[PDB]
Short mmCIF file of C-alpha atoms in Angstrom, two decimals:
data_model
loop_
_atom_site.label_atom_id
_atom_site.label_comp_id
_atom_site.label_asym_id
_atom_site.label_seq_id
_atom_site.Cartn_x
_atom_site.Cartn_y
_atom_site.Cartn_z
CA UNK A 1374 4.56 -1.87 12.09
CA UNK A 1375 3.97 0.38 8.96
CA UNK A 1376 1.15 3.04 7.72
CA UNK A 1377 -0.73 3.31 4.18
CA UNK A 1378 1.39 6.32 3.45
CA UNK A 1379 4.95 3.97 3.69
CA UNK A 1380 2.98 1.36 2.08
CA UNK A 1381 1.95 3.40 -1.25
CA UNK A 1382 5.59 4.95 -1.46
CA UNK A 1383 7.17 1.47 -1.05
CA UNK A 1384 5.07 -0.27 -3.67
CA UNK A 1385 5.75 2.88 -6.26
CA UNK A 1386 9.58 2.84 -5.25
CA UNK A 1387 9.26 -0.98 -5.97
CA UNK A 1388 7.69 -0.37 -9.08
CA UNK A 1389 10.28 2.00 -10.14
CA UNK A 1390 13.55 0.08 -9.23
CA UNK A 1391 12.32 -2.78 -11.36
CA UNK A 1392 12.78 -0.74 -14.55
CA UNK A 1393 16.36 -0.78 -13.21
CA UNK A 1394 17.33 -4.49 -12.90
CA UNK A 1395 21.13 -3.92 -12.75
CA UNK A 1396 21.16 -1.24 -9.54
CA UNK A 1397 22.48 1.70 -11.56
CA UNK A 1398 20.20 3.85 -9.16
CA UNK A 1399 20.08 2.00 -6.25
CA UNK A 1400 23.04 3.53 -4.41
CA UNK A 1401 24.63 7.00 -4.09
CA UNK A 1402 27.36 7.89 -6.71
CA UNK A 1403 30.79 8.16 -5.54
CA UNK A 1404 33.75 10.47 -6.97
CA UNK A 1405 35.76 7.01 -7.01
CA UNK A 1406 33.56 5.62 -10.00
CA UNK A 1407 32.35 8.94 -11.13
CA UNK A 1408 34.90 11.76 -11.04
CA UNK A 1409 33.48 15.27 -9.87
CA UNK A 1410 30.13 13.86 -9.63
CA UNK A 1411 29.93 16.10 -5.66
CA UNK A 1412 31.22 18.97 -7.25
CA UNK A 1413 28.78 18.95 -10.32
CA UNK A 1414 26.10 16.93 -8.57
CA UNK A 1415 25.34 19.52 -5.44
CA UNK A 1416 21.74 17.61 -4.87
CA UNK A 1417 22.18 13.73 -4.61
CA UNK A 1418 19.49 11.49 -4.48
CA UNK A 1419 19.54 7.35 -5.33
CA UNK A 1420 16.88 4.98 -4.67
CA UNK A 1421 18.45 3.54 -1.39
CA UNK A 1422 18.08 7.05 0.17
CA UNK A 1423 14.88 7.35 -1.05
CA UNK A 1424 13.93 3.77 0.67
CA UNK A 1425 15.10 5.26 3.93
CA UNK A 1426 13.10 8.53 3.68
CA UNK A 1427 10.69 5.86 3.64
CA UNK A 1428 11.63 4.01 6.47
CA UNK A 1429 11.76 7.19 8.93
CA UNK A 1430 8.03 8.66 7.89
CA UNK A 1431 9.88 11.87 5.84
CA UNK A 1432 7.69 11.78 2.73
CA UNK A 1433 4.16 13.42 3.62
CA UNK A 1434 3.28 13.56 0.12
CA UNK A 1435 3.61 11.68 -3.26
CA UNK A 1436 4.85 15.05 -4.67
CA UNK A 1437 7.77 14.94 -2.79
CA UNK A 1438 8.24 11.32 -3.14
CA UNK A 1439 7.89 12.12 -7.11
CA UNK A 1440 10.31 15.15 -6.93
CA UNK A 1441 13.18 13.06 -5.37
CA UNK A 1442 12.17 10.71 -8.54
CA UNK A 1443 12.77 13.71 -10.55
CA UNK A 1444 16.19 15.03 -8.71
CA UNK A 1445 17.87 11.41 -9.59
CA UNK A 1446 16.70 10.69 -12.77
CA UNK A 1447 17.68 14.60 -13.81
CA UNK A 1448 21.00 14.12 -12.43
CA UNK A 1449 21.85 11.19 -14.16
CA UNK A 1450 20.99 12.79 -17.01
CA UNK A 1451 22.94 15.64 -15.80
CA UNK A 1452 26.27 13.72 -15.32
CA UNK A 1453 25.91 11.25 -18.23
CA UNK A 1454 26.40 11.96 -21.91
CA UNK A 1455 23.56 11.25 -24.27
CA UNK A 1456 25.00 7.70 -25.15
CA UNK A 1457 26.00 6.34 -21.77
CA UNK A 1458 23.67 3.45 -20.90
CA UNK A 1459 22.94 5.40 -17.56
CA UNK A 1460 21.60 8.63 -19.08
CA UNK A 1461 19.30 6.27 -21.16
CA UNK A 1462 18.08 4.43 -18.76
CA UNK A 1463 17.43 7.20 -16.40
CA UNK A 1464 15.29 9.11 -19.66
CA UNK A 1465 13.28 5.91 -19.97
CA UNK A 1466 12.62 5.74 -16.25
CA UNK A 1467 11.75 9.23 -15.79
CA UNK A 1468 9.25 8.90 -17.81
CA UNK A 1469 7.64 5.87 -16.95
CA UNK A 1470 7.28 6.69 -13.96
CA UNK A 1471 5.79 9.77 -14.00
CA UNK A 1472 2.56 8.44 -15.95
CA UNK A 1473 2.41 5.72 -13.10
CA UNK A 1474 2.47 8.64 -10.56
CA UNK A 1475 0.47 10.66 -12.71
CA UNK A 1476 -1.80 13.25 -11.26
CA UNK A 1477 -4.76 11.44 -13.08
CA UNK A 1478 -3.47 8.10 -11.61
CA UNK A 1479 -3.45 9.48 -8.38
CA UNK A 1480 -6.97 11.10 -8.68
CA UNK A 1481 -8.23 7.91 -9.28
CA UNK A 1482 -6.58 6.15 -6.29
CA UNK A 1483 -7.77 9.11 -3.90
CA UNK A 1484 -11.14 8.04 -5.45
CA UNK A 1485 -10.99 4.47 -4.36
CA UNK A 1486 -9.27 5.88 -0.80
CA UNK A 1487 -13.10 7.09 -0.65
CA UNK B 769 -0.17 -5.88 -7.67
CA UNK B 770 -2.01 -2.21 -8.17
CA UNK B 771 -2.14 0.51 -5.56
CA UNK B 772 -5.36 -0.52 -4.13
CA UNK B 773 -4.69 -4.00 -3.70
CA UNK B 774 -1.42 -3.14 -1.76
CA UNK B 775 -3.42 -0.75 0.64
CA UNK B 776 -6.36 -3.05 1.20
CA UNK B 777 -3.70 -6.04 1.58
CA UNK B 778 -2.04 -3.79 4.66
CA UNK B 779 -6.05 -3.36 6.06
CA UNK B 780 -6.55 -6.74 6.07
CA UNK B 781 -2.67 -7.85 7.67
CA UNK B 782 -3.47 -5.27 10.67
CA UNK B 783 -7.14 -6.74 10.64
CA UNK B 784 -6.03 -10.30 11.42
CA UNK B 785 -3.30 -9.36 13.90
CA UNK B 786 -6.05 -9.40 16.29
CA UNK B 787 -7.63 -12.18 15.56
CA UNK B 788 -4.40 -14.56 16.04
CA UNK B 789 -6.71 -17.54 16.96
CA UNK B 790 -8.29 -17.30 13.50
CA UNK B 791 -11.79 -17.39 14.58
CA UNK B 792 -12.58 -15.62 11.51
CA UNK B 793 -9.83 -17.00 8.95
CA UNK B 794 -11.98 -19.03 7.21
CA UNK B 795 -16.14 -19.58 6.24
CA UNK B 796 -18.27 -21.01 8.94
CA UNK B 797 -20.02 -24.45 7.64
CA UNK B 798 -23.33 -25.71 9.41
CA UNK B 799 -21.34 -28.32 10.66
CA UNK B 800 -19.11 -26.01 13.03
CA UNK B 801 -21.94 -23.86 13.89
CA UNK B 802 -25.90 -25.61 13.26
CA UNK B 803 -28.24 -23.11 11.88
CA UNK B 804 -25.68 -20.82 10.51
CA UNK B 805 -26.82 -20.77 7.32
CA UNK B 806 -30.40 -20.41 8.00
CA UNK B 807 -29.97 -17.67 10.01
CA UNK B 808 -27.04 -15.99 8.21
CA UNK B 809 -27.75 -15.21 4.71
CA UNK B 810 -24.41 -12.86 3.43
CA UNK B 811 -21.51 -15.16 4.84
CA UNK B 812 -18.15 -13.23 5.08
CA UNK B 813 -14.70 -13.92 6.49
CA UNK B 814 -11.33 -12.84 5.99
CA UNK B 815 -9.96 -15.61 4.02
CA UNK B 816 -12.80 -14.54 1.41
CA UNK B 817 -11.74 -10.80 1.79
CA UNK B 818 -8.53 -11.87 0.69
CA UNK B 819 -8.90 -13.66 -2.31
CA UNK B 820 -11.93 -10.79 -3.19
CA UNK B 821 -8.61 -8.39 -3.14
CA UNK B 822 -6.08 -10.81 -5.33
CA UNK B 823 -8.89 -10.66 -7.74
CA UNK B 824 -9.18 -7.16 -7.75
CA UNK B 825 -13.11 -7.04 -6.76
CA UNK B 826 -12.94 -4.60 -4.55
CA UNK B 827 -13.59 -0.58 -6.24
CA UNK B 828 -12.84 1.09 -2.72
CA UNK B 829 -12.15 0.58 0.69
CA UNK B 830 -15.72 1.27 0.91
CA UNK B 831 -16.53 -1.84 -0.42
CA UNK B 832 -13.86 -3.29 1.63
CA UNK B 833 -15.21 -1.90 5.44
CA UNK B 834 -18.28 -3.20 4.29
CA UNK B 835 -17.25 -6.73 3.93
CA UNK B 836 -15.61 -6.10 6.83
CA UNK B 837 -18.54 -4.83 9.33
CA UNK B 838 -20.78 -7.70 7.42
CA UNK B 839 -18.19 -10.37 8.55
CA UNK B 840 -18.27 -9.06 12.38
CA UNK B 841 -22.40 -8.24 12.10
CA UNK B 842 -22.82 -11.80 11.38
CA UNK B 843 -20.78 -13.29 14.22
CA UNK B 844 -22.58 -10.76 16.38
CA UNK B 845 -25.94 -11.72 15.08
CA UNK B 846 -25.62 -15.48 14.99
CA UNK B 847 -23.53 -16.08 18.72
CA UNK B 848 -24.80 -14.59 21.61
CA UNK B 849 -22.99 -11.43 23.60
CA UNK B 850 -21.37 -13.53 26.09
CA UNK B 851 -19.53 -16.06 23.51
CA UNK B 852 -15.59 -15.72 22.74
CA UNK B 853 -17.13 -14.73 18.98
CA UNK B 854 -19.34 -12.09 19.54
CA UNK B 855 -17.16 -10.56 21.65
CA UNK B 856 -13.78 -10.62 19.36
CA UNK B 857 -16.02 -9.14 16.46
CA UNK B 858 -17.64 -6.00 18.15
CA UNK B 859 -13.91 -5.68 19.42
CA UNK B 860 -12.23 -5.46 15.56
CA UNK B 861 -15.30 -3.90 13.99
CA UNK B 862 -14.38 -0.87 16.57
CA UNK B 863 -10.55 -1.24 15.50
CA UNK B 864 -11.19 -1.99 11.62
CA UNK B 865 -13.26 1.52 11.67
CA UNK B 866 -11.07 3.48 13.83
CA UNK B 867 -8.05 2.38 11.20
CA UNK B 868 -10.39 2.66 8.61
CA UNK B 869 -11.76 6.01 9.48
CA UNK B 870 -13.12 9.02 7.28
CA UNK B 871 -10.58 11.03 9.70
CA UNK B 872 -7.98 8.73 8.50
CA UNK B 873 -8.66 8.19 5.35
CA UNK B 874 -8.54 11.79 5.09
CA UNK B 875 -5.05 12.21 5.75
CA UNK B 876 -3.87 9.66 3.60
CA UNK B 877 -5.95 11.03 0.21
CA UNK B 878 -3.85 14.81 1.29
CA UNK B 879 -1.01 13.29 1.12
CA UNK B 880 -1.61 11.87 -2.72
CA UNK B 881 -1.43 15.11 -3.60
#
């Protein structure tokens, strides 16, 4: 019981938490593992939220799909020094996915939408 | 899988929801139906869309309606208007183009911006 819109958004989330194998971004960040992450971390966003954004229609665009993308990988990077495994990974990612949701890529697709 | 494959993949699911029978599933031989294939030149069915989409074949949903609307043309074309097939077909060619709509289609290209 799904639309194109959920359908596009789940296949990029999917193709975005498989650059992260080990769930670093799958889940919200708590103070517990991470401590003042609320206090310097004032916008949190994690993969599993984004999934449920999903889930209740709250994405009307790929650009605001793509700037929750942006929020978590930035805060990562935000939180975690240079040479933390998570900061890395989050650079990597950020990237990546941003050429696969690039606005060429998505001219093309909007092509082929006809 | 790419973008487009994923989107056609979800035309084709809601497409054969209504068809839970399968008369369209697979291609039509002369044995099932004599004279099919001397009356029906362009042979289409949704088994065939499918595989057309795994191998990427497809440029557009364009290309995609159209195999569609050929698949229901035929059934319409080959059994006559009171037969279980010619009715099914005139009733998903209306459904496959009102979900497949330029009004439609519209609204998800604005929101790939």
């Amino acid at each position: 019981e799904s639309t194109p819109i959920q359908q596009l958004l789940e296949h990029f989330l999917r193709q975005l938490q498989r650059k992260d194998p080990h769930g670093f971004f799958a889940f919200p960040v708590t103070d517990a593992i991470a401590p003042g992450y609320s206090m310097i971390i004032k916008h949190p966003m994690d993969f599993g939220t984004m999934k449920d954004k999903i889930v209740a229609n709250e994405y009307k665009s790929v650009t605001e799909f793509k700037a929750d993308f942006k929020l978590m990988c930035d805060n990562a990077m935000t939180y975690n020094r240079p040479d933390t495994v998570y900061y890395k990974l989050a650079k990597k990612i950020l990237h990546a996915g941003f050429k696969m949701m690039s606005k060429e890529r998505l001219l093309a697709l909007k092509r082929s939408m006809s």
